[PDB]
Structure formats: C-alpha cells, structure tokens
Homo-oligomer: A and B are copies of this chain.
Amino acid sequence: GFFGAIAGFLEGGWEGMIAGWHGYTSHGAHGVAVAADLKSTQEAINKITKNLNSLSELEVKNLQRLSGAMNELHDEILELDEKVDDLRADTISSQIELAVLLSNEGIINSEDEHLLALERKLKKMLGPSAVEIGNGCFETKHKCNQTCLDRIAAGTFNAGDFSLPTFDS
C-alpha cells in the first residue's frame, strides 16, 4: 500500500507464488527463486474468517404487519408503516455496508504489515552476517536458490548450513 510505495517495496508481484498470498523471493546466480510463506497466508485467512463470523453475527428485528391496522380502513396508517419498513431497510443496509467497507479496508491495508512481519522472520534466520537493506531485502554472504528459499519459507533454514553465525534461540 502507501507504506510499500514510500518505503520502496516492490510494487509488482510473483506469479510463481502459488501456495500462498505472501512470501519470499531470492535473487542470485540461479536467477530468481520464489517461495510462499504458509504461516503468513494462514494468519491472513484466519483473520478474514473471524471477520466473516463477526459480520454474520448481526441480528435485527423482523418487520411484519401491524396486527391492528386493517386494509382500506387504515390505509393512511398502513402507508406510514410501509415508510417505517423502508427506512429501516435503508438504514440498516448502509450500516452493514459501512461494516463491510471497514473490514475490507483492514484486509487490504494489512498486506504491507505481513511483509514487515515476514522481514522479521527472514532476518533472524539469516543471522548477523546478513545485511538489511530496508526495502524488504537482505544481502546474504551465501547463495540461496529454490532449495534454500524453501527452507526459509518453512522456517527450517539455518545459517550454520553455510558455517555462518546464527542468533541463538
């Protein structure tokens, strides 16, 4: 979003990222490898799922006929009753539209926050020998092709796999 646009995050996307919405790319001699992060994708899906349940919880009163107002005899009253139903429908609809708007607003905007969190996951795995650029990228001393990138996405990557120093857990 606006964060990524200002921060210089890549505005494009990766067609090869098919197993998830969010993840990592690797650029080196191998060309460009792409891996989806399932943890980030699941978290996003769960948030949306909870949001769906929340929107589905709304209860409003039924609109039925007046028991006392008779057709023809009370048509003036019945016209007002019609107006009451119509305005209720109008008002609650716009309230629901507002609730859904804010939900989608939250969902779309949260994208860059996933990227910022994925940065933190990446950084710790890469170890203190990696250099943080700021645009969502890190420079590594080692090569990282698709086999490497997959271990990163899975959270199994260790910097010791190139005899590089690690942050101890």
Contacts and interface: CB of A to CB of B under 8 A. Distances in A.
Interface residues of A, number: 67
A25 to B, nearest CB: 15
Report the copy number of this chain in the oligomer: 3
Interface string A94-123: 110011011000000010011011111111
Interface in A51-94: 54, 58-61, 66-69, 74-77, 79-81, 83-84, 86-88, 90-92, 94
Interface stretch (A11-19, A28-36, A40-48, A140-148): A40-48
Contacts of A95: 91, 94-95, 98
Contacts of A86: 61
A114 B44 contact: no
A-side interface mostly: helix
A3 B119 CA distance: 11
A104 to B, nearest CB: 11
Contacts of A7: 116-121
Given A5-B39, A6-B120, 14 more contacts: A2-B110, A2-B113, A2-B117, A7-B120, A8-B120, A8-B124, A9-B120, A58-B94, A66-B83, A68-B76, A74-B76, A81-B83, A128-B131, A134-B167
Interface of A: 2-9, 37, 39-40, 43-44, 46-47, 54, 58-61, 66-69, 74-77, 79-81, 83-84, 86-88, 90-92, 94-95, 98-99, 101-102, 110, 113-114, 116-124, 128, 131, 133-137, 139, 167-168
